[PDB]
């Protein structure tokens, strides 16, 4: 069909920053996570390397995708697909050439795929403040992120869903640890510590004559993978403006819905969640200045000069959003 042909053509840009992820979601019948993960697994030869039966991979991916909520505007399967594809591009950075093993690459991509699964569209702080069952279960720390992991791993146990069935026990143990370490690091309360440690690495950076990063121990390797997926998670402002604006519309819709719940419960409305007292453009400029740019400028220093085009786009978008403020 024409739809399947245009989808295949759009997926040819899977190695590019700025993939038309929304168009892919439309063309695939709302299966962007499944089609993008499958495409990436084939591109990186991951099915052959880890002896993953294709039917098992597709069954797991469709199941995983089904557990992202279609009525959550931002934290859904499209966001997951976007973070997966963004991580995939970051893994191909010239400065990281042949740095990570196939198992580490698998861990980073898998972590990206499950990183927000079963997200309810409300923040950790909302869950803590409302005395939710999730916050009770997880003792108020990385409430959502612990839950995303638990769901992502539990789904491997469904019928014909264990994509890691042919890995050795050691490979499985290592992958599981890496995935947990990466997803727990997506908790925004850990952003400042992650960045501080990334800065320390940049200052003590070691490279070959070609600028390829030399990372020997687990601590340094997982730290780079944690920051990589965190960057991918916070990559919306670094994408072509047309895409970024759509992401902004989506997070604002989600935030406003949380604010509506807070208002009717008589709670203080969280920052950026009050639809009656919002400043969307000022908030984006603040998000870039205080969080996104500091992180991306540091990442850019680590892999200099490979991320220059990403940083240039971020600054272009910041300039545009600022121009919309009278
Ligand atoms: C597209 C613009 O995005 C946002 O403005 C934000 C904010 C302010 N926080 N935020 C989150 C990032 C990671 C995890 C939860 C929220 C996003 C996407
Ligand atoms: Mg998250
Ligand atoms: Zn996310």
Swiss-Prot record:
Disorder named in the UniProt entry? Genetic variations in PDE4D might be associated with susceptibility to stroke. PubMed:17006457 states that association with stroke has to be considered with caution.
How does it get modified after it is made? Long isoforms that share a conserved PKA phosphorylation site in the N-terminus are activated by PKA through phosphorylation. Isoform 3 and isoform 7 are activated by phosphorylation (in vitro), but not isoform 6. Sumoylation of long isoforms by PIAS4 augments their activation by PKA phosphorylation and represses their inhibition by ERK phosphorylation.
At which positions is Zn(2+) 2 bound?
A: 116
Q: Which residues bind Mn(2+)?
A: 116
Q: So where does Zn(2+) 1 get bound?
A: 79, 115-116, 233
The record's family statement is: Belongs to the cyclic nucleotide phosphodiesterase family. PDE4 subfamily.
Q: What is this protein called?
A: 3',5'-cyclic-AMP phosphodiesterase 4D
Per UniProt, Mg(2+) binds at: 116
According to its UniProt entry, the function of this protein is described as: Hydrolyzes the second messenger cAMP, which is a key regulator of many important physiological processes.
* Residues at the active site: 75 (proton donor)
- The cysteines covalently paired via disulfide bonds are none
Taxonomically, which superkingdom? Eukaryota
Which tissues carry this protein?
Expressed in colonic epithelial cells (at protein level). Widespread; most abundant in skeletal muscle.
Where, by residue number, does 3',5'-cyclic AMP bind? Answer: 75, 284, 287
Summarize subunit and interaction data from the UniProt record for this chain.
Homodimer for the long isoforms. Isoforms with truncated N-termini are monomeric. Isoform 3 is part of a ternary complex containing PRKAR2A, PRKAR2B and AKAP9. Interacts with PDE4DIP. Identified in a complex composed of RYR1, PDE4D, PKA, FKBP1A and protein phosphatase 1 (PP1). Isoform 5, isoform N3 and isoform 12 bind RACK1 via their unique N-terminus. Binds ARRB2. Interacts (via N-terminal region) with SHANK2 (via proline-rich region); the interaction is increased in a PKA-dependent manner.
PDEase domain boundaries: 1-326
Subcellular localization, as worded in the UniProt entry: Apical cell membrane; Cytoplasm; Membrane; Cytoplasm, Cytoskeleton
Name the residues that bind AMP.
75, 116, 233, 236, 284, 287
């Amino acid at each position: 069909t024409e739809q399947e042909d245009v989808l295949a053509k759009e997926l040819e840009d899977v190695n590019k920053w700025g993939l038309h992820v929304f168009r892919i979601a439309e063309l695939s019948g709302n299966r962007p996570l499944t089609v993008i993960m499958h495409t990436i697994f084939q591109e990186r030869d991951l099915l052959k390397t880890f002896k993953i039966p294709v039917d098992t991979l597709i069954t797991y991916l469709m199941t995983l995708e089904d557990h992202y909520h279609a009525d959550v505007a931002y934290h859904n399967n499209i966001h997951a697909a976007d973070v997966v594809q963004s991580t995939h591009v970051l893994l191909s950075t010239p400065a990281l050439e042949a740095v990570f093993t196939d198992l580490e690459i698998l861990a980073a991509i898998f972590a990206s795929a499950i990183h927000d699964v079963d997200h309810p569209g409300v923040s950790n702080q909302f869950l803590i403040n409302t005395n939710s069952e999730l916050a009770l279960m997880y003792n108020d720390s990385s409430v959502l992120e612990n839950h995303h992991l638990a769901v992502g791993f539990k789904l491997l146990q469904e019928e014909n869903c264990d994509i890691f069935q042919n890995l050795t026990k050691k490979q499985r143990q290592s992958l599981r640890k890496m995935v947990i370490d990466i997803v727990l690091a997506t908790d925004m309360s850990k952003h400042m510590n992650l960045l501080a440690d990334l800065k320390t690495m940049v200052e003590t950076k070691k490279v070959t004559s070609s600028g390829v990063l030399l990372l020997d121990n687990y601590s340094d390797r997982i730290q780079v993978l944690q920051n990589m997926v965190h960057c991918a998670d916070l990559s919306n402002p670094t994408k072509p403006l047309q895409l970024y604006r759509q992401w902004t519309d989506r997070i604002m819709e989600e935030f406003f819905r949380q604010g509506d719940r807070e208002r009717e419960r008589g709670m203080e409305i969280s920052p950026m969640c009050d639809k009656h007292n919002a400043s969307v453009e000022k908030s984006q400029v603040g998000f870039i200045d205080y969080i996104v740019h500091p992180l991306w400028e540091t990442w850019a220093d680590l892999v200099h000069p490979d991320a220059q085009d990403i940083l240039d786009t971020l600054e272009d978008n910041r300039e545009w959003y600022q121009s919309t403020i009278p």
